[PDB]
Write an enzyme that holds these catalytic residues in place. Structure first.
Site, mmCIF file in Angstrom:
data_model
loop_
_atom_site.group_PDB
_atom_site.id
_atom_site.type_symbol
_atom_site.label_atom_id
_atom_site.label_comp_id
_atom_site.label_asym_id
_atom_site.label_seq_id
_atom_site.Cartn_x
_atom_site.Cartn_y
_atom_site.Cartn_z
ATOM 1 N NE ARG A 107 -10.004 1.196 8.113
ATOM 2 C CZ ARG A 107 -10.361 2.482 8.058
ATOM 3 N NH1 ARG A 107 -11.472 2.919 8.657
ATOM 4 N NH2 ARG A 107 -9.602 3.345 7.387
ATOM 5 N N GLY A 157 -3.227 4.419 9.275
ATOM 6 C CA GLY A 157 -4.562 3.838 9.335
ATOM 7 C C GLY A 157 -4.551 2.327 9.469
ATOM 8 C CB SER A 204 -0.918 -0.001 1.228
ATOM 9 O OG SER A 204 -2.058 0.831 1.033
ATOM 10 C CE1 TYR A 251 -3.017 -2.736 -7.086
ATOM 11 C CE2 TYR A 251 -1.578 -4.636 -6.796
ATOM 12 C CZ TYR A 251 -2.657 -4.034 -7.411
ATOM 13 O OH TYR A 251 -3.389 -4.724 -8.342
ATOM 14 C CD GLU A 256 -6.044 -10.295 -7.347
ATOM 15 O OE1 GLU A 256 -7.243 -9.948 -7.313
ATOM 16 O OE2 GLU A 256 -5.259 -10.006 -8.274
ATOM 17 C CB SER A 301 2.395 -6.931 -2.653
ATOM 18 O OG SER A 301 1.346 -7.863 -2.454
#
Ligand SMILES: C[C@@H]1CN(C(=O)c2cc(Cn3c(=O)[nH]c(=O)c4ccccc43)ccc2F)CCN1CC(F)(F)F
Length: 349
Positions: free
Chosen positions: A216, A209, A202, A245, A326, A242
């Site tokens: 989440r 977060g 990410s 991203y 995935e 990954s």
């Protein structure tokens, strides 16, 4: 002056960087003059998700005349940077997916900023320590010569896809992470079969977060068609998949990536998009079947959890949308975050 290790201190600076958050917002074409970081709220993000769900509805059932109203209503809630404008029309599945990705990022950015603007103000304490405590996460540096470090570096070394060779990866720091109460949350799935150590990349501006709230799922308001396998938590067994991203670049080449223990159980295997609201009875996860997969003979165990760190080989799957595997879970309690890596991207282009 803070007694935390330097790598931990530099991580905390990275993830709570206010300028980085703003930079992420402008990358998603938001107007900071009208929608600044301080003006950002959950109910506006949720309302934006709902308007995006109305656009999803109209696109699935076929006109540019009627779509205009729906598209404009989205831009009312989330101001974009176009001047005296006429902004672009939101009229297809890509538009839905692209704005869904923006709102996903705003959700985690809002959390980060709310922690920063909540809490107390004491100039006697080092803000690094103050901000560290807000994550409610124990972060320790993994020693470079340890067993788990060697296994983690081998996972990074072995699973970099040939199709993602525009850069290579340098592991700067390996952190062992333990979110408060997550072990207790995980307990129902701790002895479940097919537990696996998988990657989640990410952008760095989501990590405050993620570490405070956990990984989440996208909320009820979000358009399920904006997510290839519906609204879950997505992982990969190839590090580069990954790592893509992270959204790093030549002028922002430091990224962060998670290693999570994921209770997959009985995997529901799929070759193409399937925007599900819930799993078939008896299934605990979805596996998106890749054309390539890590060699199953080279699987290795770390703390009782399988680590698919083999080099990529042919999976034997023929008519699939995916080049690489995935994995998606639809219950947040099926994830136990284990490590966090700081990566240096060497772009060769
Ligand atoms: C990080 C969480 C959970 N999300 C995901 O796991 C997710 C993530 C992606 C993109 N993605 C990704 O961002 N990182 C990956 O490592 C990854 C691996 C395989 C496939 C997709 C990956 C696409 C769709 C998703 F639902 C969506 C965003 N977000 C939910 C939110 F409510 F907090 F915003």
């Amino acid at each position: 002056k803070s007694k935390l290790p330097k790598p931990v201190q530099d991580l905390i600076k990275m993830i709570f960087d206010v300028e980085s958050m703003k930079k992420a917002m402008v990358e998603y074409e938001i107007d900071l003059q009208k929608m600044p970081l301080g003006k950002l709220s959950k109910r506006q993000i949720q309302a934006a998700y709902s308007i995006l769900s109305e656009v999803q509805q109209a696109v699935s059932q076929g006109s540019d005349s009627q779509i205009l109203d729906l598209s404009n209503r989205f831009y009312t809630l989330i101001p974009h940077d176009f001047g005296m404008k006429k902004p672009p029309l939101l009229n297809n599945a890509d538009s839905v997916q692209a704005k869904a990705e923006m709102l996903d990022n705003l959700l985690d950015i809002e959390v980060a900023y709310s922690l920063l603007r909540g809490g107390s103000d004491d100039s006697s304490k080092d803000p690094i320590d103050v901000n560290y405590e807000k994550l409610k996460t124990d972060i320790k540096v993994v020693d470079r010569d340890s067993e788990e470090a060697e296994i983690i570096r081998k996972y990074v070394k072995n699973t970099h896809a040939t199709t993602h060779n525009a850069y290579d990866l340098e592991v700067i720091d390996i952190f062992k992470i333990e979110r408060e109460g997550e072990c207790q949350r995980y307990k129902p799935f701790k002895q479940l079969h097919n537990r696996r150590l998988l990657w989640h990349g990410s952008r760095t501006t989501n990590f405050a977060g993620i570490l405070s709230q956990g990984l989440r799922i996208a909320p009820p308001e979000a358009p399920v068609t904006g997510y290839m396998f519906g609204k879950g938590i997505y992982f990969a067994d190839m590090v580069s998949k990954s790592a893509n991203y992270c959204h790093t670049s030549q002028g922002d080449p430091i990224g962060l990536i998670l290693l999570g223990e994921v209770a997959l159980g009985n995997m529901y295997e799929l070759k193409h998009a399937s925007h599900i609201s819930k799993l078939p009875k008896g299934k605990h996860s979805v596996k998106g079947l890749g054309k390539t997969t890590p060699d199953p003979s080279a699987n290795i165990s770390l703390d009782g959890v399988d680590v698919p760190l083999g080099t990529g080989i042919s999976s034997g799957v023929n008519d699939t949308s995916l080049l690489y595997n995935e994995y998606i879970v639809y219950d947040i309690a099926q994830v136990n975050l284990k490590y966090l890596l700081k990566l240096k991207f060497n772009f060769k282009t």
